[PDB]
Amino acid sequence: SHMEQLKCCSGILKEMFAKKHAAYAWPFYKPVDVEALGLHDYCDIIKHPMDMSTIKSKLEAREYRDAQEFGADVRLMFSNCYKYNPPDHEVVAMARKLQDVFEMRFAKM
Ligand SMILES: Cc1[nH]c(-c2ccccc2)cc1C(N)=O
Numbered sequence: 001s002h003m004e005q006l007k008c009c010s011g012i013l014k015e016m017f018a019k020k021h022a023a024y025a026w027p028f029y030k031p032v033d034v035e036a037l038g039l040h041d042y043c044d045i046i047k048h049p050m051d052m053s054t055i056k057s058k059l060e061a062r063e064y065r066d067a068q069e070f071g072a073d074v075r076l077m078f079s080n081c082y083k084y085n086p087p088d089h090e091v092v093a094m095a096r097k098l099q100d101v102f103e104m105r106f107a108k109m
Pocket of ligand 1: 026027028032033080081084085091
């Protein structure tokens with residue numbers, strides 16, 4: 001059921017925003033501020049930017065037909081981090097930690 005799926009998707013994103021995962025989930029809360037120092041080339045490398053607040057708004061505006069469409073945006077957010085940043089950057093390790101939380105929840109639904 002697509003309706004039951006999207007309510008579970010809202011639940012997964014709720015845990016991702018919770019205090020428990022806050023230590024590594026904070027860089028993915030809001031869209032990447034391209035006006036900040038060191039992020040002048042972000043728009044040149046990342047063509048489709050995605051973050052948790054945009055996903056939350058897209059769920060509320062019913063922009064996802066099913067769980068797979070929600071999952072695609074969550075993975076786009078992580079893939080943007082892996083593409084733009086160097087492999088040894090701290091944000092890449094944080095992305096892996098938050099993706100572990102998502103992948104385990106997304107598989108068990
Ligand atoms: C995903 C991501 N978030 C941030 C960030 C930086 C400062 C404050 C809030 C978010 C940077 C990146 C990145 N370098 O990819």
